[PDB]
Design a protein around this ligand. Sequence first.
Ligand SMILES: [Mg+2]
Ligand SMILES: [Zn+2]
Lengths: 661, 41, 96, 232, 973
Amino acid sequence: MIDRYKHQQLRIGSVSPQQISAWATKILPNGEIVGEVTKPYTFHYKTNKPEKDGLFCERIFGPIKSGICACGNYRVIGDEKEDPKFCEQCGVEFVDSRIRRYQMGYIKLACPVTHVWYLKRLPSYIANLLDKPLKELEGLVYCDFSFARPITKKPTFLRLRGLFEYEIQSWKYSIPLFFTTQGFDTFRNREISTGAGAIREQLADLDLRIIIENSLVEWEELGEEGHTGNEWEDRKVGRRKDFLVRRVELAKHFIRTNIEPEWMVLCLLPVLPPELRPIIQIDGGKLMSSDINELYRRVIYRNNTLTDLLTTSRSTPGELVMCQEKLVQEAVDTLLDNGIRGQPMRDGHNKVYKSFSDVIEGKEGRFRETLLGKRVDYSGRSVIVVGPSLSLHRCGLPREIAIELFQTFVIRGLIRQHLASNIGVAKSKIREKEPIVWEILQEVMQGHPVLLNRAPTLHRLGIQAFQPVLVEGRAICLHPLVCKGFNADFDGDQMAVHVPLSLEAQVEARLLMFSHMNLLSPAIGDPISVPTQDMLIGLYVLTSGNHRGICVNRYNPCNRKEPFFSNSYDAIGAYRQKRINLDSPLWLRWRLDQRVIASRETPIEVHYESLGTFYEIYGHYLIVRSLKKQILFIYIRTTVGHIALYREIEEAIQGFSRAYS
Amino acid sequence: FQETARVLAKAALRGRIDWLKGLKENVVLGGVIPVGTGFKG
Amino acid sequence: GLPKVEQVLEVRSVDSISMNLEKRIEGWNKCITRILGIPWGFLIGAELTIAQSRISLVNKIQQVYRSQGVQIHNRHLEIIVRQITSKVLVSEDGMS
Amino acid sequence: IEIWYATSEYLRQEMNPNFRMTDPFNPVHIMSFSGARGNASQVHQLVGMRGLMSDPQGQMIDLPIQSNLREGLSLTEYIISCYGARKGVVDTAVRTSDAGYLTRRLVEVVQHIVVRRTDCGTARGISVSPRNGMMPERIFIQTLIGRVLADDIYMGPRCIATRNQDIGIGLVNRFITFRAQPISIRTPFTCRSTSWICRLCYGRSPTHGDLVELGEAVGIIAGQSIGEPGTQ
Amino acid sequence: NEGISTIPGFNQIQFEGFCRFIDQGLTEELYKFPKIEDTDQEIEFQLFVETYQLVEPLIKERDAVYESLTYSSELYVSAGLIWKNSRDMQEQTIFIGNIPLMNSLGTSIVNGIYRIVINQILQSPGIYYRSELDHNGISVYTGTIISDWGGRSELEIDRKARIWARVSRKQKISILVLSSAMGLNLREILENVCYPEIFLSFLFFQQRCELGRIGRRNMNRRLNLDIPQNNTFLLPRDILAAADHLIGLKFGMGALDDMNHLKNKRIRSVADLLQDQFGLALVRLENVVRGTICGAIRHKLIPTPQNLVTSTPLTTTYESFFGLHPLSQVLDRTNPLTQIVHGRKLSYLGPGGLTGRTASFRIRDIHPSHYGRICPIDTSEGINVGLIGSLAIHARIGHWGSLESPFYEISERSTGVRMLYLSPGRDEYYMVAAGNSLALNQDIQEEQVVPARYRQEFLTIAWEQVHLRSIFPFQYFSIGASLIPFIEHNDANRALMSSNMQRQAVPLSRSEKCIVGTGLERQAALDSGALAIAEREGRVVYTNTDKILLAGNGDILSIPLVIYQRSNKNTCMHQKLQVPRGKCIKKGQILADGAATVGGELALGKNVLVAYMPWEGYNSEDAVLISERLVYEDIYTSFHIRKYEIQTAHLLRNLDKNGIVMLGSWVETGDILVGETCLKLPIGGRGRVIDVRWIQKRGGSSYNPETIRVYILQKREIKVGDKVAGRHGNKGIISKILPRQDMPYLQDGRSVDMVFNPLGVPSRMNVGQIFECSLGLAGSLLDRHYRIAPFDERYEQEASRKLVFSELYEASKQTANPWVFEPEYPGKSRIFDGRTGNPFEQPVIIGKPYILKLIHQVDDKIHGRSSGHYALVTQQPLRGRAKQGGQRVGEMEVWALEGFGVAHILQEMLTYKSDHIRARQEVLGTTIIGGTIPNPEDAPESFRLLVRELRSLALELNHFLVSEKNFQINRKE
DNA sequence: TTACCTCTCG
RNA sequence: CGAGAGGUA
Ligand SMILES: [Mg+2]
Ligand SMILES: [Zn+2]
């Protein structure tokens, strides 16, 4: 066979600054760009209207009510024939409020910042690429230290070629005076380095193919006199040995992967769509406003302070800018992954704030909590009861539960039979509990199955399907023999019901999820539905037997049972008419072939007569034979109880056969 | 299923591509799982 | 009981499950190299380690279940055991 | 400790003979013998002696319990008995939790395995001998049922079984009568891939008693099967 | 003086704790208040603690609940401020704030809610020695110093003498250096310490150094020392002594401590917590006072002492404690038993206490020290099993935090006996016996032997060598276990279940007392608070359903009664009079009865005729078959009241002029109760509107939105699906109700009310029920009620059998019913079938036991949903019956569906039914029309959200499909 | 561990 | 809506 082929793929990748922009940018009829949100304002102060350039702004994130623009007029969406996509007065985007769920916005940052994950891991990805001490790259990042030779890409007149150096005491003013206005800037950019602009630039001009060459050589040289020294030393030799492999690998991937190494330090910053951070008025909820929003404002603020500081005060020293650079970085860090560095970063009243990593992680993290399982419609719950008379394929469903689950189906019926004019008309009939609603409900559920599950669903048998039968009362009735699979008892257990809507779904339930089809357990092949408690007691009693010797007769039978029956029906009859008891011994003629399970015992007495007939008495049977060696008669000693079990098993087989026909 | 941040980072860097050939993955995407009636033959 | 099954399945220490086993595996590896050549020695050594390991792990889990009267078929344990035992580690000396 | 354990144990041993010989139809016997409810240990406590108990930290308490529930436990005995009960309650709570972690993790390792092909094409199989381990015949039988043979088995010039044939209880028995020692079976360890299995290597299904169908989730069934017996 | 000679009141601990806080606690905290002056020198404030007065409550307690206020008391204290500039004195008494008051029962009413404070168990400050087995060779030993601060101090000795402090994360820190820090000479140390040679060979204060009084005493006992009690510090000599002991262990001369013993644990209570909070509040008043002083400077104004201090700090602290502390909980008022049990609870967890997931297995087992103090049976099952427990009947709290069990001294002395209370430590050193003196041989009584406890062990010794005897019947158990009859014959596992179920019983419309009981039902009623007892002696002069007047020596006292009122758990409270007019009463005697109480005893259930036999499968597993008599004679009917509240066609028939539904209306789901913003009835509530309350309110910035509350009553009868239980651990759910004619019947003609399965007793090990059913039958016939204390076999072997069999015989003879006692099979009889008239084959157990109806009813349980409201972010269905929500298909369920191979069914659950907005809206239409539903192609919202969230952390996820036929790659959105 | 229910509180 | 507490099976 030729396989039917389907190819699907999912790709994950870090994104460039230009992309984050395109995710959130539009050009209006005026020709004006929209998208960056600058102000920290959320809505309005007691006005309940989104502010402009605000975290909830309509123009950047889409309209709040459909068709009603910023101005307050309403143009009918569904028609683009003569509708300004963007109104002259305001950016309207008239079509839908759904966009507020999906639309994105971006924030420009004056200072380059660094992502936490690459830096945080002990085998830091940035460090692995850098080949410089982890402390040195980090120190520059969180504390004021300045690199001296930032770019190896371009030649520079000053030549200390130093690393991060704390002291800027080196003449810097005379150097600026000697140099032209910004002549110093060209030189400084080439040489002096600060913050993370330096990291971004060092990462940006790096030679990967060269990096591999150096590494391999160093890796080859290391291992000289390897495995031949004091315990302390070898350990160190190895740790370097690996850092080297790890680094070669990262670079190789970069060569063939289309992801640019500089993207790790971030120029633009992304913003979640406004709905996903409802921040609804905390009208007594008190937590309705999102911490997402709270964290967002801080980054927005420090950034605005810096943009102004630079514009306002070129004269003010780098000390003013240096002070607030660190502040901006820290807000972003908490927003991305707080607790990575272990900083509490919490308001005193508040718990440590929720970083976006927390949102994703764990049981309540998006993937486990929402992606793997979800709440559903067309479902119900109630307590369970014994239901002995039901058949294996059936279950009893309370009527109140049913009317809820099968409502749509009944409305159709009322309309189809023309007992109601409109959908609204019918819903009324359902409420007055008129008797007709019940005849229609019964008709609709006749060949439609339903699914039942118990709470701790340990194994497949936890969910099984049944044909529902309407019952009055408020509990679900279940067949006695299905309880082992569900592990259910009748002392407070509850169950849930689901209805299968599609035709495809309905076929699967009848054909692959019904009890008759699943009578053997998955683990070794054993029967899962077998008679278990009271039922077993009854079967044992029927087959238990009768007193045999001293128990039935006081004195030896030597010094000195009777009923003989021809067909089994007569015997069962005598039991009813009280002629005999369940345990009384009896003799039954058998016309068939010696199927009685009994021990291999030779006859107790053979009695042989002169004309030729021989009678053989065994413990449970008498066989009469003649000279021609033919068995004239066989009689079995038994009790009524034994014949009753045989008859039921036999009749059931024959009945099923006669029904098929 | 356990270390979500750590895995996701390593991957973004390497541009990993996942061909969706297992059960759990297709559940997240809300698409027919390739088992049983879903397996096509 | 259950703790033991978690221990066996999560193989924190190879010796922890069976002492006799660690012995064999460390021993085999040292000895095999001298006896056989590069193309064939790693391959044969792997096949032997894989075979003993597989028998022991199934047998250890199973003894715990049989003590308490729980009977589970082997095929099921084997699907799980294979994944535990299906991978190899390239060594320090190997760079290409 | 020793005198009391012997006394308790002899009494338990002798309970069933007393019921079967002197009162065959007693309600307590019917319920236990039938299999309906009750266990010998549970009955022993109602009708014999409860016995020596273990204190926390595993030390016997030295005061025997000479009473049963019908007769009535003394205050001192009742207090000693309580020890055991806290152990049970603590174990049940713990066991329910531990089982779930083991199951979640087992399903994850083997979720991807589905039966995707009819024959892998392997010509290798594991060999099962009655010897090579001291195997009670039971164990020998259970391993073999449901598996497909990887090579022909012959007694003299006649073939008992051919490659690609499933093994059932009747065949296994013939192998036992005729003492055919080395049997080679295709098994999950003999397949050629780790992302899927083939029908012949997996063998007969536990549910429907026939070769597994293409498209079945063998892995989810395995995780669940090892885990559910865990509650016990 | 109490508890010797009688069972102590069940609320005594709360009463004593509150009193201690009111006087001693208040004074101690007040003293520490600092005199406050600022800068180089400023005005000085004086809080004179000598004169503190607490004044009476302005509102009465009933009013406080009606208007949602808090019942409290006002603290007025005198103070003087000498403004630095003035040099003169002004004195006034400022109203510092409000401190809450307790009712005798032990509850506090705060913001309208009855609240109760639970007790906590924590490790006591002191020195503890542990021997840690060492991974290599010889074992390491260690010492530790628990403190009120909680800092622990570690000292350790290795195989080579180490004497190294382990407080530093670093391995080596010197204890000797700490001794030198104390100024001790090296020479001084040598003279002080024994084992000098070993130490020769070897040649903070704010938190750890304070040891409470409890901490000091423990130190002095463990290392014999006798620094006086007023001293409360980590004086250095102690550290030296500790080292000396540490080495003695290395040489064999020592004891390793057990930390689970109760001599090493302490109990905090209402008093401690309240005192603590007072301190926090007081520090907050200092902050406020300093601040107003600064304000005075700005305005340059002469302060009035009152102006400087506000009442906010005291009130706010308590309001927060009651509302948010872990150990302050709302009282369960389901039944009278629940109210009494809640107070007695003890928790290991709490603030500054253990957490359940974290805690060790060993902390959750019984220890031999618990006897007489903490009940062995009661615990809360779950991940919290073993950590929440209950105080025993005869326990009390000592001067130190420790608990105490009463013991009788049998040793010869003048009096020859006294009842004494012993600390958990003291009694390990005496031999205690619980046996009796009824054995005599040819020697004397003193030589006879008995089982006994000594040093945490059980042994057998002669009567001469015993010192103390345990004499009380209910001493080792809590209130719930002490309400079960014939407990000796029920396995202990069941007893946990049983105590739990009594707490879940519903007060019924008419109440009846039990035929068989244990005798503690009488005290349980007295202490619940549901009865009206006399406060003065007198004669009853007028009785009306609303009130009673008692006239004693020239005064007339009016006692209000409770008619049809709601409880926290939606149950009804109603009091009914027990006293005829014209009768004399003494103080403390009963005047009226509450719900679930008849004649001064607790009555939570009814007595019914029952048979134990199999019946057509209706009783399979644990299910019950019942007669209709119970339904039509109203044996098990209960009243339930719910409240619905708001803040400010056929429908609207009920509403009045203002629009609020009138009293006496019958309402059904959908009907508006109070007039867009309309409040409407949920599903399953249908009842008379018993009352409407337009409550004006204060406290909010606006006059608090007046609250309109509606209260609705539902009368509920027994139905299929209800849960019923007995007192011995037996629980079941009703499966069928059958007409009297079809029920099994006796030789008297009567038909049994309920039928239970008989296969249950062997598995669950409760033989108590068989003894109780049989005695019940006897009492009904002979007109007797029996109250029997536990453990009756102390008197003789097989005592219970002798009581039951004898009583059954008397009933059989006096009323001539021979079936009640049958000599061949005692306790069992032969009964007949209603359907056919034929005898059942084997004899069956018939009796009248006491059966209770539980709070879990079917009506509350049932739920259904189609369509409906959807959530904002996840866009999934809502959770909860109240919220009209869906049900969860979770991880485990998916796995099962996958095993079956039902892919289509699963996809549906993940898309159309939950979270695919476009798809969801279509299916409702296809179904009404009659069409086919297509398989969805786009992604659900759940997936879309993940992408957006990731794109927020700067990562991109894309889904592409590559066409097999032409090789094109298409990006799905 | 799963599911289920009620409440209070800023 | 975020926390806390009491239950159920
Ligand atoms: Mg149950
Ligand atoms: Zn007794």
